[PDB]
């Protein structure tokens, strides 16, 4: 059952032909807003956002709870409040600490909505329940109808951080097994999740994933579906393997078997199967309730059965052998904190999450060492490598399109059949190397094509202080074929790769690329599509969640008004508003 | 809407018989949960409790989510969990921290239930989200579906504690005036309100009741039949007043007019009037959405205007001219902190709730001194004189008898029109005092029935410790006539009284009746029917609010279990977890 | 290397005769302390103990640091500072924030040892590190070497704790498994074992433990050892699986075979083996450095492969097919917290620990009831029902005997290989129920002799409070045959019984027996021979876990000195002196 937004219209309750003068330009503004957002932006499933309207304008308590009633019945996770006229302050507003809010007032004179939202602003940082304010840059005339593309472009980034919130909320991390190789996301924290995202996480044994291929627990007819796609489509690639490692025809066959049926028995573990009913097996049928999962692998499970990286790359892929979907969040080495951060940047923007590895940080100085070759162009100032140990969604090659022509990625609903094999087309699955995966699988080697806006983000947790998000919006390269395979042939050319050059304001972390990756506060990172920063920023201040490093430009910022309060300074304003108002559920 | 009650009946996840065998039992154990406090409770406005059981049984994440969408859309405020099996602990409890929640687990051997029980409590504590614990005495066999008697008492006292947690949220309190005379329980502070019980404050100015009057701005119909419904049914007691400041008959009209359009005009302030709407004052019909209010009164409304004494005793009744209703909380003096108590009481019990001032506290020496005989009896050690200034609930005559015939305060469903009409037979109204209230006034003077229990209450606002709850159970006592009637003209012969008798336990402020007036947090106190100490201390653990003083047994103090992880001793776990977990709501 | 303890003779600083008079004397101290210990006192492990004096006397500052690099040198844990004299307070006190210290002075006149003590505590206290406070209540003459049955208890009840915390120090936790069946307990805590005990954590699959039994990564050669002394001592009890269920002789043994293997496999995670070196597993001959371990077990590992039921059995006896050894620790269900209780019984007593269910409390009205007989005796009051689902360390039976030939436990160093065959012919090994345990398994089922004391112990986690500690001393008992059979029937008969009655005190949770079950923190508990309950109250100070729940009598109360400082109550000192000093480690 998916969340909704409720919207609050708010009016000054004296009669006497005041408020019924006002009356109809106060729904009309909670329509025009509803109708804004439907519109304009989806649920990251897919369907289509409901916005709940009170029934009458808000002037008072009485009215004020009627919409409460109404918005608690029908699963209200956001509120807008929007008005005209001045109103009474502390008696309309929304006290409900639990859900993001926004006040939008109509900047005019003779209708001076403006005012009213200063005030109920005041109000909430008073009483200790943020909110944030929607104020458009030119009055207009109270005769218009329109909506600024400013009080839009904040209607919208709210909205959009709003939902993500109330999302999560009530939901699942699935972590199939636990530590991965001491890596400290692995090490799930169970409060980090209830407290701040109000998850619960289930913890399952990687031997609950051995005993569903064992004892057929999964749809026999589905595998023969998904091997008939795998046949067709999968192009493969060199294998790197000493020879006396290597697998004959009929082995890497059950390998690539057991990596589907993985896959399979994965997202029926998240989501359940009512397929697994009707096969009798009624219990494994229900699932975990899960928008999120780990994947432990290395080493308990890669040191006997095939890796996963087949398996990771489908699940975050946006199609698979049934067709164009919904991707998957499925972290590699069970990395929690990297899921945290595709889970968001899902949410935000409905398309595949790249995970991956920061591998190495190509100096200038560096480059020219080895290729010979100059370091030209968006890539002047240095290279990072991002590179995961072979998995990564099939959407990152980017052989999807815009209406542009340009090389993107794109959310599930956008997505037409022939633009799906392109992205298969791109990748040849080349097996595993013996010695680090003993089990055997098959990695998903792409090339992500080059000048892309991407944001680099990541969610650390450090002792004392709580969760702290980094953000490095950037673009990818496409480096000169002799320079890339060199560099390539350097690291793990059985990966899939992206070079990354991060967008540089000459300030502290952002001085130089190398700062960048050496602030970066983990192994891991996850690359969303699109310049997404001033988005990702509004989310981390709903979830009181600092940010401890990010370059994107200070005007794009946008949080509750009291935040503005705790300081002028645009960082130092974050950590104390995080520390006063804390975790948002406990 | 009201509130309701989720059941949630847990169960092992397992199936090959295991679950098959066991659902029966699970589903009928939630029905009979739901049946018994469905039958032998109601809402403080005397409607039927639903109770919403879930859909399926849960065994784990999936189920217990779609148990929390049901609950979400139902209105639910309270849950109690039930089992009679083992099952998967942290997967299937109830995570929402706002939420009052049980567990019951059936003491069996073949159903080990508490064993789960243990195991769910467990992790609550360990997740910060605190639930009661319900564990029958005595084991029961497998096929029993009898409700033990000790289960019983677990269970309703939760539900009875639970329900008045919920149905304070998000109502208000209605300020009329500000401060009065000083007192600090008339320093209404709207974080307390917010933070703690869930409710907002709505600030009045007096000036808009006197507006209500002057403007007519009030059923003009009520007027004429609340004025002859009082002529037939008044007595009136002496005028005590001096010479010059006695009133002919036509002045004291005016005074009862306007004190008995107080009551009607405060009455639609709270709640509200549709006839209002009906009569063109579409604005005022509203009211304010509150279940408590409190009225200023001294000195700026009662040094030119009638008093409230005689509003504040008829709204506090449970009964009008317009027959028996649900009694009404309102303050005297504006004290939010009675108001409070009052409002707490009357949740618990569904009865009316006397407001006092705690005037006198009579040593043994001290009545043998001015009197020539000794108190006796149930006044052995001291007695304590409760008498507001003017005003109190009617039904505090106790004129009311129950089943066995003996002296009383019914929830207002089980009052007769008989009965009601009995407790207007023995109050006499006499003239308010000019000297103190200019405007004059009228003030419901009765005498309490003696050995009638009653639990008197208060709370207190400590900063720097916050909100904290006296209690003091005892009886109310007869004083022989020539006795009382002594001591009633020593103090004030208008104003209606109790003489009430604290039980002791020979320890701290229990050890003499002196130490019980001496250690009381205010010169306000709260009468509530019967001895509900016990109710009380389990409300005041479910919203965090410690106790500081109280007189009721060891055994009888329930609370969370994670209270006992705080300390065997019961005010030291007290203090300390009521420290940890903090107000409910922000 | 075992830790060591670290005796520090003070002493007069001023030369001219007086110094020269003590230093005889002052030494002997010193030398009688560490004959003390090391005479009356061992390892857990079984090792005696070393004790490390200072070179010198120590006098002042100059002194005092030549005896720490000396104590840091020699790896001592803990410290004993012993006098017969006046000493410069401040200048003469070990300053390790880290290590628990106690004092000893002399109660002589001429020799004035008491205020020496008196001075150093409180610098002690001031300086915020607390010490205990060795002091004789008779004062001896300053000729007499003896001592004193007082300052032996007290030597010795902090010595044998302070090894304890010591011995814990830098070792690790083996977490076989994640969370099992939502158990709050095995949701392991890692920030708790390394700040509370300094230990680390470290998580491994349960696929790992598949991997090593299909690679054949043990012992082959001990395998034929174990299934030929399995066959050779082993006695089975009849099969009670529905008749479709029950395994063929052929599977039984394999059943059998990996249920031995299991314990083989975990013992090498544990601690290495280095034949596995020899065999080229080099990797998995090191181990993880492990002194207690939790295996998860249910539901994914139970539901395909045989439980650890007989596992868990043996590596928790203190004897197995290599004859008498020092019992381990392994936590069933992977209860880590259980664990930490065993471990700590472990280290303080050097015996088996058994981990029970606390699963039924039988209520004199109950069992009457049922039985148609009333409990009798130690049992008069009620009882315990302490039954673990599957497993018990054997040495459970109390088949072993003192030195009067009463029922008991001893430490591995004091049993018998006659009495370790004892103790194994009186368990019988019933195979698993099938719809619990899928994969099959064996309960090592055995009955404990009554009349013998015990102590029940349990930790738990409360979020924003931390860990606590819970303690019960009382004895087992032995019903009449015919009631133990109703009884055991009902509940689980092919699982391990122990009947407990607790001592009560008549107040808090030791009011009755209901209140000693109810108040209990989890469904899990763990017996330790004997009344050591004063054992546990010392280590929990020393570790800073507040104690909520014993019925220890306060005159056995031992603490450190800065205690006494937090207030009289011996509860309230607690929670305060460990909200004031917190955990040792970080
Ligand atoms: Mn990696
Ligand atoms: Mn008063
Ligand atoms: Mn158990």
Redesign the interface.
């Known amino acids: 059952?998916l969340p909704k937004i409720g919207i609050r219209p708010v009016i000054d309750?004296?009669?006497m032909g005041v408020?019924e003068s006002l009356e109809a330009q106060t729904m009309n503004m909670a329509k025009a807003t509803a109708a804004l957002i439907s519109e304009k932006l989806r649920h990251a499933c897919g369907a289509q956002i409901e916005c709940v309207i009170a029934d009458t304008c808000i002037?008072?308590?009485?009215?004020?709870?009627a919409c409460?009633?109404k918005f608690?019945?029908?699963?209200v996770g956001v509120t807008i409040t929007v008005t005209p006229c001045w109103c009474y302050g502390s008696?309309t507003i929304d006290?409900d600490?639990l859900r993001p809010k926004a006040i939008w007032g109509f900047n005019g004179t003779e209708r001076p909505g403006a005012v009213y939202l200063a005030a109920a602003l005041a109000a909430h940082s008073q009483?200790?329940?943020p909110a944030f304010s929607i104020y458009g840059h030119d009055v207009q005339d109270a005769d218009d109808t329109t909506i600024p593309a400013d009080v839009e472009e904040k209607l919208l980034r709210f909205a959009r951080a709003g939902l993500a919130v109330a999302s999560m909320k009530?939901?699942?991390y699935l972590?199939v097994?636990?530590?991965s190789m001491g890596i400290a996301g692995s090490?799930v924290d169970?409060?980090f999740f209830?407290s701040w995202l109000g998850m619960?996480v289930?913890?399952?044994?990687?031997?609950?994933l051995?005993?569903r291929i064992?004892?057929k627990i999964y749809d026999e007819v589905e595998l023969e579906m998904a091997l008939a796609w795998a046949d067709k489509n999968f192009r493969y690639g060199e294998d790197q393997n000493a020879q006396h490692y290597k697998r004959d025809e009929e082995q890497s066959r059950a390998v690539l078997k057991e990596s589907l049926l993985m896959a399979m028995c994965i997202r029926d573990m998240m989501q359940?199967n009512e397929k697994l009913a009707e096969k009798g097996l009624?219990?494994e049928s229900?699932?975990?309730?899960?928008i999120a999962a780990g994947f432990?692998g290395q080493?308990?499970?890669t040191?006997?059965?095939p890796n996963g990286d087949t398996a990771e790359a489908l699940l975050n892929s946006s199609f698979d052998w049934n067709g164009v979907r919904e991707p998957f969040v499925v972290a590699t080495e069970n990395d929690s904190l990297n899921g945290v951060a595709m889970l968001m940047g899902h949410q935000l923007t409905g398309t595949a999450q790249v995970f991956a590895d920061v591998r190495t940080y190509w100096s200038p100085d560096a480059v020219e060492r080895v290729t010979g070759q100059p370091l030209t162009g968006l890539a002047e100032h240095g290279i990072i490598h991002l590179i995961n140990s072979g998995s990564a969604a099939l959407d990152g090659s980017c052989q999807q399109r815009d209406e542009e022509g340009k090389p993107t990625m794109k959310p599930h609903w956008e997505i037409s059949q022939k633009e799906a094999d392109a992205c298969l087309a791109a990748t040849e699955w080349c097996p595993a190397i013996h010695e680090y995966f003993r089990g055997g699988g098959y990695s998903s080697r792409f090339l992500t094509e080059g000048g892309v806006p991407f944001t680099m983000t990541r969610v650390n947790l450090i002792?004392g202080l709580g969760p702290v998000l980094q953000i490095a919006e950037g673009w990818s390269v496409e480096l000169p074929k002799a320079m890339h395979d060199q560099l390539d042939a350097r690291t793990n050319s059985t990966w899939p790769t992206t070079w990354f050059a991060p967008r540089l304001t000459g300030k502290g972390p952002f001085a130089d690329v190398y700062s960048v990756m050496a602030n970066w506060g983990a192994n891991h990172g996850v690359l969303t599509i699109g310049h997404v920063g001033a988005d990702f920023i509004t989310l981390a201040a709903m979830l009181r969640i600092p940010v401890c490093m990010h370059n994107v430009e200070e005007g794009k910022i946008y949080r509750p008004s009291s935040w503005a309060a705790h300081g002028m300074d645009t960082e130092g304003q974050d950590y104390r508003a995080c520390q006063n108002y804390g975790p948002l559920?406990?």
């Open positions: 059952s309750g004296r009669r408020r002037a008072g308590m009485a009215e004020s709870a409460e009633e608690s019945r029908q699963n008696e006290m600490p009483k200790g329940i009530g939901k699942s972590s097994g636990g530590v090490i169970h409060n209830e619960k289930q913890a399952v044994d990687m031997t609950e051995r005993r064992d004892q359940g009624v219990e229900l699932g975990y309730n899960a432990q080493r308990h499970w040191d006997q059965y002792k559920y406990k």
